[PDB]
DNA sequence: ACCGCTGCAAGGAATAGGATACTTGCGGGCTATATGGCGGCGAATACCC
């Protein structure tokens, strides 16, 4: 498994491909209709920035990465997944943030 | 005390011979598209509920 991957959270699909310079991905993204990580192709993100010229920040590639990344708290994030893990559901995503928590912790 | 003369250079036709500009191949010096191997296994989709 990718430690960046399921630190993140992130399929590593997508990924590969921002790592690589062929995609967006935001930031913080708030204050709009984006999400904290959604991708963009090249031409969405244009779009994007023309429909909404704010301060949203869409990123590519390895800063990108890198402030994502560093913009995270991990023990609350513990907390909120230990809680979500409580209970719905204990069938695959049990596993998944069982190994998540691990990784995490 | 004036002049036509001789004579002494300047520019044409025929030969030998070195200097010297021109040409060339190199030697080292440098930079920058496969197609007869399985087996196990775990993660990542697919699927049809």
Redesign the pocket.
């Known amino acids: 498994?990718?430690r960046i991957?399921?630190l993140l959270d992130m399929?590593?699909?997508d990924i590969e491909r921002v790592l690589y310079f062929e995609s967006y991905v935001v930031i913080e993204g708030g204050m709009t209709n984006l999400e904290r990580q959604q991708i963009l192709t090249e031409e969405q993100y244009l779009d994007a920035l023309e429909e909404f010229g704010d301060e949203f920040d869409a990123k590519m590639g390895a800063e990108a990465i890198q402030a994502l990344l560093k913009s995270m708290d991990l023990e609350q994030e513990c907390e909120q997944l230990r809680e979500e893990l409580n209970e719905t559901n204990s069938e695959t995503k049990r596993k998944k943030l069982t190994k998540r928590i691990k990784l995490l912790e």
Do not use: Q
Request: proline content about 29%.
């Open positions: 498994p990718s991957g399921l399929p590593l699909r």
